[PDB]
Amino acid sequence: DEYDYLFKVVLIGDSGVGKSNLLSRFTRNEFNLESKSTIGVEFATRSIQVDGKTIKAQIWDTAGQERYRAITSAYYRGAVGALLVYDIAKHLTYENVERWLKELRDHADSNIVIMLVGNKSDLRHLRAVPTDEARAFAEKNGLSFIETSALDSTNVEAAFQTILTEIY
Amino acid sequence: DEYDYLFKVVLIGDSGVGKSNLLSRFTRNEFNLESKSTIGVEFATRSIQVDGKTIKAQIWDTAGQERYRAITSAYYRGAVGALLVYDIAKHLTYENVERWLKELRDHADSNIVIMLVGNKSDLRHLRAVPTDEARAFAEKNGLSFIETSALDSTNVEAAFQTILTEIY
Ligand SMILES: Nc1nc2c(ncn2[C@@H]2O[C@H](COP(=O)(O)OP(=O)(O)O)[C@@H](O)[C@H]2O)c(=O)[nH]1
Numbered sequence: 151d152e153y154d155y156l157f158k159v160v161l162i163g164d165s166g167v168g169k170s171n172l173l174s175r176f177t178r179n180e181f182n183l184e185s186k187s188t189i190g191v192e193f194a195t196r197s198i199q200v201d202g203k204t205i206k207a208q209i210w211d212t213a214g215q216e217r218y219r220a221i222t223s224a225y226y227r228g229a230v231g232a233l234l235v236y237d238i239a240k241h242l243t244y245e246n247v248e249r250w251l252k253e254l255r256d257h258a259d260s261n262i263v264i265m266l267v268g269n270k271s272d273l274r275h276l277r278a279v280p281t282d283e284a285r286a287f288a289e290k291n292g293l294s295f296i297e298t299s300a301l302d303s304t305n306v307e308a309a310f311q312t313i314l315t316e317i318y
Numbered sequence: 319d320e321y322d323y324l325f326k327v328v329l330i331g332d333s334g335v336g337k338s339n340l341l342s343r344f345t346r347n348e349f350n351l352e353s354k355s356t357i358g359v360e361f362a363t364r365s366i367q368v369d370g371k372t373i374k375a376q377i378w379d380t381a382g383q384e385r386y387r388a389i390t391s392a393y394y395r396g397a398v399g400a401l402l403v404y405d406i407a408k409h410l411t412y413e414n415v416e417r418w419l420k421e422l423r424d425h426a427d428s429n430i431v432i433m434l435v436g437n438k439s440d441l442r443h444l445r446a447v448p449t450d451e452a453r454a455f456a457e458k459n460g461l462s463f464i465e466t467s468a469l470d471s472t473n474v475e476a477a478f479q480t481i482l483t484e485i486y
C-alpha cells in the first residue's frame with residue numbers, strides 16, 4: 151500500500167538448508183518441521199522499518215529444480231540483495247558456498263549485496279561448520295555474516311534487517 | 319532453455335478452493351490434504367510435448383494475502399490463460415466468481431483464455447453448487463467449464479490440456 155521503497159532479496163543455497171523457512175519465518179512468522187517449500191519459485195513480502203523508512207522486503211525462494219533461461223533470469227532480475235544460506239550442521243552445504251557465490255557472479259546484477267547465512271544454529275550440538283571458519287570466509291570475500299535459526303527465530307529478523315540496511 | 323513456447327497460466331479464486339493442489343497436480347500429479355499452499359505468490363513449470371513441439375506451461379498460484387500494485391500487476395502480466403476456481407461444496411466461493419472475473423477484466427490481457435473450474439468434485443455428497451448452473455454461467459460469459467477433483471485426480475489433467483489447447 152503506502153511505503154517508501156521496495157527491495158527484492160533472493161535466497162540461494164543447497165536444498166534443505168532452510169531457505170523456505172527463513173522466508174516463512176521472516177514474512178509470516180511461520181515455521182515448518184515438515185517442509186512446505188515451493189516446488190518452483192515463490193516470493194512473499196514483509197514491511198519493515200529501516201532508518202525510519204518503511205520498506206517492503208520482497209523475499210524470493212526456489213527449489214532450484216527449474217533452471218531454464220527464462221526462470222533463472224526472472225529469479226535474479228532486479229534483486230538488490232541475496233542471502234547465501236548453508237546448514238551449520240551439514241558441512242557439504244558450506245563446501246558448496248563457493249559455487250553459489252560464482253552462481254551469483256554469473257547471473258546477479260553487479261550491485262547486489264550478498265550476505266552469508268549459517269542457518270540451523272539451534273543444532274549447534276551437532277555443529278559441522280565452525281563459526282570462525284565461515285566468518286573468515288565471509289570477510290575475505292567482502293560480505294556480511296550471521297548465524298540464524300528459522301526454528302527458534304534467533305537472528306532471523308536481524309539477518310534481513312542487516313542486509314536491507316546495507317542495501318539502503 | 320530448449321522449448322518452443324512458454325505459456326503463463328494463473329490460478330485465481332477464493333482461498334481454500336484447492337488452487338495450490340491443482341498446481342501440484344498439474345506439475346507433479348501430487349495432492350496434499352494438509353495444504354502446502356504458497357504464503358505469497360509462486361509459480362512452477364510443467365513441460366508438455368504437443369505437435370512435435372515442446373511447451374512450457376508456467377503455472378502461477380497465489381495466497382491472495384499480499385495486495386499492492388506492484389505484485390498485483392506482475393501476477394497477471396503476460397498470462398495467456400486463467401483458471402478461475404471455486405469449491406463445489408462451498409456456495410460462497412462460487413458467488414465470488416463474478417468478482418474474480420472482474421479482476422481479470424481490468425488486470426489481465428483482454429484476450430486471456432479463461433476456464434471456470436469447479437473443484438472438489440469428490441465431495442459430491444456435500445455439493446452446494448449445481449453443475450448445470452455453473453455451466454450456464456460459463457456459457458453466458460464465454461468461459462470454458464469443467465469440474466475437477468485435485469484429491470482423486472478427476473479431470474485435472476484434462477482441465478490443463480483443455481485450456482492449453484485453447485491457448486495454443
Ligand atoms: N533445526 C532446524 N531445522 C531447520 C531450520 N530451518 C529449516 N529447517 C528444517 O530443515 C529442513 C529443510 O528445510 P527447507 O526450508 O525446506 O529448506 P530449503 O530446501 O533450503 O528451502 C526442514 O525439515 C526444516 O524444518 C532451522 O533453523 N533449524
Ligand SMILES: Nc1nc2c(ncn2[C@@H]2O[C@H](COP(=O)(O)OP(=O)(O)O)[C@@H](O)[C@H]2O)c(=O)[nH]1
Pocket residue numbers: 331332333334335336337338339340350351352353354355380437438439440441466467468469470
Ligand atoms: N476433498 C477435496 N479437498 C480438496 C481438493 N482440492 C483441494 N482440497 C483440500 O482443501 C483445502 C484447501 O486447498 P488449498 O489447495 O490449500 O487451496 P487454495 O487455498 O485455493 O490455494 C486443503 O485441505 C486441500 O487438501 C479436492 O478436489 N477435494
